[PDB]
Amino acid sequence: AARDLICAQKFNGLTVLPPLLTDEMIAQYTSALLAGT
Amino acid sequence: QCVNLTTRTQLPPAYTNSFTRGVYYPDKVFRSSVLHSTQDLFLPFFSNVTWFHAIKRFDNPVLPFNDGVYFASTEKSNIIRGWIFGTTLDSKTQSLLIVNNATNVVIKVCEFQFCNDPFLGMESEFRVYSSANNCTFEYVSQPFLNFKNLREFVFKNIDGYFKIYSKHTPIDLPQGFSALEPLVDLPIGINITRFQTLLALHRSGWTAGAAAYYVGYLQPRTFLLKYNENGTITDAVDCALDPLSETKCTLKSFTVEKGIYQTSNFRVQPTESIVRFPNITNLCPFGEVFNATRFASVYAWNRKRISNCVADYSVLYNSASFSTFKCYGVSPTKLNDLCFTNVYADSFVIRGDEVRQIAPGQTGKIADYNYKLPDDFTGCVIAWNSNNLDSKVGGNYNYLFRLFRKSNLKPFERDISTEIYQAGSTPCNGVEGFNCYFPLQSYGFQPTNGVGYQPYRVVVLSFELLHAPATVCGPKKSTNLVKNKCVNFNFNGLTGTGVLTESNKKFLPFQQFGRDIADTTDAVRDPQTLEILDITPCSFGGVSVITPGTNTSNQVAVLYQGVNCTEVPVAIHADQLTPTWRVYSTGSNVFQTRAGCLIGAEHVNNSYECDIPIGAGICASYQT
Amino acid sequence: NFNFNGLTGTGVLTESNKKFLPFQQFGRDIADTTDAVRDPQTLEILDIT
Amino acid sequence: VDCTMYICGDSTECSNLLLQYGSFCTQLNRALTGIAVEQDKNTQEVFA
Amino acid sequence: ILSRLDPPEAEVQIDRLITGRLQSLQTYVTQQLIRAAEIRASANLAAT
Amino acid sequence: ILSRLDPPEAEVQIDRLITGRLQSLQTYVTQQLIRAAEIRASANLAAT
């Protein structure tokens, strides 16, 4: 059902790469800092 | 006298892993402590190279010369004097005879007259070619003459010269590096596609020695070269062998530190093409013109304007012979793709004697008096005799002939003049009399009239070229479609590449195309059956290389990006714009990630600190 | 300013001692320019700056 | 960005004409690589 | 345009189109660099 | 080119060569400016 903007811009020579760090790890870091402080 | 023998043994092509042989200086430039890159016809490394053995026994086969020969000869006692090159090595064509004499060579590109085998009673019993002919280009100069000799010769014939890059290197193959130099440049400039090595055989019947030789070929390749403090080449690197070599070539270095690098791109390289087109509906009658029971008269030939049909010239050459389509401005096979407003077809009947009279700038009775043709007419003509039909038995006093007129006439008009002609000084008053004449006469055909006066129905298919969409252009064909494959398509003039699947979109009855917010086609209504399809072009992505430090090891890991490797080219020969380094899947631990999937690394349930970041919460390291 | 066999140039000419091979005609540098030439009347290797 | 297929699709005839412009795509590619790595660098220093 | 007329002037058209598209690509790249620099500065302030 | 082709046509190719050199040294100047700005920021931090 329909094409996403990702593939749409994909099929003309433009690509989007994913980040390195993820939201779960970011939340883990935040929780660790909060507990420590 | 040319001799016979029956001593030969064969062998399938033996192979060795050609390590580092096939290098030569490509120019006359001097460099020091400089690294350079080149790209030309070259012998690939670590390639399977044929071994031919010649040792009674006797081997002088005919072998091709596709591009060039990498010739390595471990030989002694000079069992070979000279060689020959050419296109056919027969009498009719030119050939080359480069025979390295005892203290010379002779060259000549010219006609010969060959036996199958040369020799002398060392060839002055010149039965290379059993009869003497003239020759053009000759050259005489000083003699250019455990295994210890390694005769390496590269035969190149480009730019109209003979690039014998000859290296008398004094030596399987030695694992090392050794380049080679040009020696002679001679501008002959003929085809030369086949050659035969010639040898020197001396008697003890006849006697031959023992020798070995090899054959190689060159392909267009990109190479990297290294120069030491002097102008001597030390090492070379191929840029199409392995991903490590590709990384070295890209980074422009001989040592690579631990890291991750990008080399090239990747696409699907589609297969075949699809030409969907709509149907064909409208036809116009040619049977009514070519099969009329009562033809149009010579004076009242009918000028028919053609449109609102299709131009099925496909069925226009499907008539029996005698079709004088000495046509103007178009080929017959081409005809089906031209378009005109008004094809003013003319149809009259003329006795077969003067069929050639009606043509641009032609003379004759009807050509100067009845029907004079334009000198700028563009169109075809179809003629055929109607001796069987157009003449009736009991006396054809029904049909009529016309023979006369007053003066010349313009191109492209109908003349039906039947009036009295005023001939002399006396007036006519419109009646036959004093210098007066009435031109009309009838056929009166009995079955006896001869071939020249037998009818030949000439139809001048006058394609008058003007500006219309011209429904009558020519029939269009179509094919069958295949789904779920990388396909080039052309939908009623809309061309493109992609895959086609089903959909649920609801088009309006009068919409054909379909565009997204990005202003490009996404759906097409196929003409023959009124369905809806979704267009998705073929996938693609980049290529990244993962490797530890060169000082540590040599293994590498390769990553694909953004491609489900349920779809990675398992490949037949080439369906991968990655430079075809697919690896076996099961044992190499193919694992689907969120950044494509990886081939070459295994996965554990452990956890450590990150060494090399790959992406999306994953790392990699060279351990264990 | 000079022109050796169609090769134009300008500068101070001096004797250069790079071990040119017989098939080597002239010299080039890293920046892809002419550096050393041989006289096609006396056959001596020279330097350019 | 994929420069060649952006500039002229898949027309092989054009790719012949692009050689006469010199190295005009690698600079763009390396600039994009630099910004891409800088993003992850920034996130890592700000959070770790 | 590849199948209407002669190569000698079809190539003129190809050349001009190539020039225009490459210029547009250059403009976009420069804009991206500027925005990246500004974001970098903001990131340093946030880290401090 | 001067010894084989007329200035009536030389100027077009030398003109494209000029403009190519000008965008070359122009993006060169632009990246020099960007590097100078980031270097100035680093120097200010070092001074503080």
Side-chain angles (χ1 to χ4, degrees):
Chain A
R3 196 191 253 173
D4 209 3
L5 179 61
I6 303 304
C7 312
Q9 61 83 58
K10 181 179 177 181
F11 265 109
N12 280 336
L14 303 316
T15 46
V16 164
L17 315 174
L20 178 55
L21 279 178
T22 60
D23 307 347
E24 297 80 0
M25 321 155 78
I26 289 179
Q28 198 155 5
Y29 270 132
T30 281
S31 65
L33 277 166
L34 191 44
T37 184
Chain B
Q1 91 78 15
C2 286
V3 309
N4 311 87
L5 56 105
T6 307
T7 50
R8 255 200 186 89
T9 52
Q10 281 74 241
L11 179 82
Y15 307 127
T16 202
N17 209 30
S18 60
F19 311 88
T20 46
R21 309 224 70 93
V23 303
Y24 52 98
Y25 295 88
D27 46 12
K28 298 177 180 62
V29 190
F30 172 84
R31 307 179 175 100
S32 175
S33 285
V34 161
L35 273 68
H36 206 40
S37 172
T38 57
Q39 191 275 328
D40 258 312
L41 230 44
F42 282 96
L43 165 66
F45 276 176
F46 295 88
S47 201
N48 282 325
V49 303
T50 312
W51 182 353
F52 272 177
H53 201 278
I55 170 65
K56 294 297 296 172
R57 270 275 290 133
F58 203 80
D59 274 340
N60 284 326
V62 289
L63 60 174
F65 187 68
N66 305 288
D67 295 354
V69 175
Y70 172 76
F71 203 108
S73 178
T74 57
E75 204 181 301
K76 205 171 48 169
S77 298
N78 289 300
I79 317 191
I80 276 179
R81 270 283 98 80
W83 297 325
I84 47 176
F85 283 69
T87 295
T88 324
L89 280 298
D90 72 330
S91 171
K92 283 96 159 178
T93 186
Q94 293 73 13
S95 98
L96 273 295
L97 185 133
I98 320 89
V99 166
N100 324 329
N101 292 78
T103 172
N104 288 296
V105 309
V106 64
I107 318 85
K108 33 165 180 154
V109 48
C110 38
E111 284 95 331
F112 300 75
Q113 227 169 330
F114 285 111
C115 311
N116 234 5
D117 186 53
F119 52 82
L120 207 150
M122 161 274 268
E123 288 141 1
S124 297
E125 288 279 324
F126 82 92
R127 274 92 67 115
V128 201
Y129 63 112
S130 39
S131 154
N133 299 313
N134 52 268
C135 284
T136 67
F137 183 105
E138 289 185 354
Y139 179 70
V140 190
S141 188
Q142 79 91 29
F144 333 103
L145 50 84
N146 50 91
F147 300 140
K148 290 293 207 65
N149 285 314
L150 184 79
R151 263 94 182 276
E152 299 316 298
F153 294 78
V154 167
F155 308 137
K156 279 176 63 179
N157 263 7
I158 65 168
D159 318 315
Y161 276 80
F162 185 76
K163 274 74 53 189
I164 174 63
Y165 296 151
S166 169
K167 195 66 176 299
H168 199 307
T169 286
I171 193 65
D172 58 339
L173 307 159
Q175 289 178 354
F177 213 69
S178 291
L180 72 88
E181 324 170 340
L183 204 139
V184 164
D185 209 39
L186 286 189
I188 286 92
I190 77 164
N191 282 331
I192 298 168
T193 186
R194 57 176 269 175
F195 93 107
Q196 180 202 337
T197 184
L198 295 183
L199 77 166
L201 70 166
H202 196 78
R203 328 307 175 187
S204 298
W206 32 259
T207 312
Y213 60 102
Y214 322 82
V215 171
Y217 298 114
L218 324 173
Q219 305 145 29
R221 287 290 204 85
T222 306
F223 265 47
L224 190 68
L225 316 96
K226 180 182 183 293
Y227 300 76
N228 75 318
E229 68 174 3
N230 314 326
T232 61
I233 311 195
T234 290
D235 210 334
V237 159
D238 185 352
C239 297
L241 190 70
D242 85 7
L244 177 53
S245 290
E246 200 185 347
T247 291
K248 283 167 158 170
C249 296
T250 293
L251 269 198
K252 187 40 195 185
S253 169
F254 266 60
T255 61
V256 175
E257 202 33 78
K258 169 167 66 69
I260 174 166
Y261 308 90
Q262 201 161 333
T263 55
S264 73
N265 285 320
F266 156 67
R267 299 174 184 88
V268 185
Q269 185 266 114
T271 62
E272 71 91 29
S273 177
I274 286 298
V275 70
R276 317 298 321 132
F277 261 103
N279 281 342
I280 310 96
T281 169
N282 291 321
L283 279 296
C284 37
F286 310 131
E288 190 182 359
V289 180
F290 301 160
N291 282 328
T293 65
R294 198 159 319 269
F295 43 91
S297 92
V298 72
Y299 53 94
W301 57 262
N302 218 314
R303 168 196 293 270
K304 174 178 285 292
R305 189 170 67 65
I306 297 170
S307 280
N308 301 271
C309 66
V310 71
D312 39 351
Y313 315 127
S314 46
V315 281
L316 192 141
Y317 323 124
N318 60 332
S319 65
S321 69
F322 47 58
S323 46
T324 317
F325 44 81
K326 62 213 172 313
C327 193
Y328 323 117
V330 72
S331 155
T333 72
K334 153 62 202 72
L335 220 38
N336 269 301
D337 296 343
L338 290 181
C339 302
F340 326 90
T341 60
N342 311 321
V343 185
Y344 295 110
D346 310 335
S347 154
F348 54 87
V349 158
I350 285 300
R351 35 182 281 265
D353 219 27
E354 63 197 88
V355 56
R356 329 152 294 300
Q357 276 199 24
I358 46 169
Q362 277 265 356
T363 79
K365 276 190 177 182
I366 71 171
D368 76 337
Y369 264 50
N370 290 341
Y371 199 49
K372 185 206 196 306
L373 278 201
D375 306 320
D376 57 354
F377 164 58
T378 63
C380 306
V381 164
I382 293 156
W384 66 90
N385 48 3
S386 292
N387 172 44
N388 78 312
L389 196 149
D390 272 340
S391 303
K392 45 185 277 287
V393 202
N396 189 356
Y397 298 88
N398 195 356
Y399 300 152
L400 80 86
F401 284 117
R402 175 180 312 288
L403 322 170
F404 286 99
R405 200 190 193 285
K406 248 204 196 294
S407 61
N408 277 8
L409 264 187
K410 220 257 175 190
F412 279 151
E413 76 305 348
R414 182 191 297 115
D415 180 23
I416 62 168
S417 170
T418 74
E419 197 37 70
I420 303 282
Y421 161 69
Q422 194 200 355
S425 68
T426 56
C428 270
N429 317 318
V431 75
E432 283 201 344
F434 274 20
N435 312 300
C436 294
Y437 170 59
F438 194 92
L440 275 180
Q441 274 183 330
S442 173
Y443 281 22
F445 277 176
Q446 291 172 329
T448 49
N449 272 344
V451 166
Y453 308 88
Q454 279 154 14
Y456 254 82
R457 303 197 218 176
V458 177
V459 169
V460 178
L461 319 88
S462 179
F463 328 136
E464 175 62 30
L465 172 43
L466 294 162
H467 326 91
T471 76
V472 49
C473 292
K476 302 284 104 180
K477 47 185 282 287
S478 299
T479 173
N480 165 279
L481 62 98
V482 52
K483 310 200 276 167
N484 297 115
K485 267 195 48 177
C486 203
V487 167
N488 290 317
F489 57 82
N490 175 16
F491 281 87
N492 201 2
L494 195 150
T495 62
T497 304
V499 308
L500 315 178
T501 73
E502 295 81 42
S503 88
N504 52 47
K505 296 179 179 68
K506 311 165 152 36
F507 267 20
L508 281 309
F510 62 98
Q511 266 153 340
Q512 316 316 118
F513 297 165
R515 276 189 207 261
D516 57 354
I517 190 64
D519 197 1
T520 181
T521 49
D522 74 327
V524 55
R525 177 189 289 275
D526 41 349
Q528 311 229 2
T529 170
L530 286 309
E531 313 319 307
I532 295 302
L533 303 173
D534 288 17
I535 309 175
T536 284
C538 296
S539 45
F540 80 105
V543 158
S544 306
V545 179
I546 295 98
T547 166
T550 303
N551 200 6
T552 288
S553 174
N554 269 15
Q555 333 197 20
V556 295
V558 183
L559 172 74
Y560 297 93
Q561 303 175 331
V563 283
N564 202 339
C565 53
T566 70
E567 186 270 328
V568 47
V570 181
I572 312 300
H573 68 287
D575 53 351
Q576 213 170 11
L577 281 197
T578 87
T580 325
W581 30 246
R582 181 191 186 267
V583 172
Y584 70 79
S585 159
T586 89
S588 180
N589 313 120
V590 163
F591 179 75
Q592 166 81 3
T593 80
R594 304 311 316 301
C597 88
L598 198 71
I599 307 161
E602 49 281 30
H603 297 270
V604 309
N605 266 17
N606 281 265
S607 295
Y608 318 85
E609 82 92 21
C610 197
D611 179 19
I612 297 168
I614 169 65
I618 304 292
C619 307
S621 179
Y622 173 65
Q623 288 298 112
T624 313
Chain C
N1 46 12
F2 53 85
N3 178 307
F4 255 60
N5 319 291
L7 161 73
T8 56
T10 309
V12 169
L13 286 84
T14 180
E15 183 44 66
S16 54
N17 49 6
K18 290 184 286 293
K19 276 79 69 176
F20 264 57
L21 294 199
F23 63 93
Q24 280 161 352
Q25 199 62 21
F26 67 94
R28 280 227 169 123
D29 61 341
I30 167 64
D32 177 26
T33 44
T34 308
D35 181 34
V37 201
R38 188 190 303 273
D39 196 308
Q41 311 185 192
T42 88
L43 284 74
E44 188 59 29
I45 165 176
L46 287 168
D47 216 332
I48 299 182
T49 295
Chain D
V1 179
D2 191 2
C3 85
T4 69
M5 158 269 254
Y6 183 32
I7 174 58
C8 64
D10 39 350
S11 62
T12 61
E13 303 87 34
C14 155
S15 187
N16 308 113
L17 274 75
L18 286 174
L19 266 299
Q20 300 75 344
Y21 277 79
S23 68
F24 221 83
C25 266
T26 56
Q27 315 65 18
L28 316 179
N29 293 334
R30 68 189 69 257
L32 297 188
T33 314
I35 173 178
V37 307
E38 160 279 349
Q39 285 307 288
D40 294 326
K41 182 34 68 183
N42 277 345
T43 307
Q44 175 187 2
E45 37 207 339
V46 70
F47 263 111
Chain E
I1 198 167
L2 280 175
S3 85
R4 319 299 309 296
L5 54 96
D6 85 10
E9 165 291 309
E11 80 73 40
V12 174
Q13 300 311 285
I14 298 306
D15 168 23
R16 80 191 298 297
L17 267 192
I18 288 182
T19 60
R21 288 182 175 169
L22 84 89
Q23 155 276 335
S24 51
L25 203 176
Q26 290 297 144
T27 307
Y28 169 82
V29 167
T30 298
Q31 295 303 108
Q32 281 293 111
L33 280 316
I34 303 313
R35 286 182 296 274
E38 172 279 335
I39 281 300
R40 145 67 72 170
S42 186
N44 314 115
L45 169 162
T48 278
Chain F
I1 294 167
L2 298 173
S3 63
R4 198 173 65 235
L5 167 62
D6 51 3
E9 181 45 32
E11 84 299 348
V12 172
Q13 303 310 297
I14 84 180
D15 159 356
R16 183 182 140 163
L17 178 38
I18 298 157
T19 81
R21 279 168 183 156
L22 323 173
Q23 315 123 333
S24 317
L25 51 55
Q26 190 140 344
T27 75
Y28 172 79
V29 161
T30 303
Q31 56 82 17
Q32 286 297 288
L33 290 176
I34 294 309
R35 300 173 193 269
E38 67 84 19
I39 281 280
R40 194 195 36 229
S42 192
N44 278 336
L45 179 66
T48 299

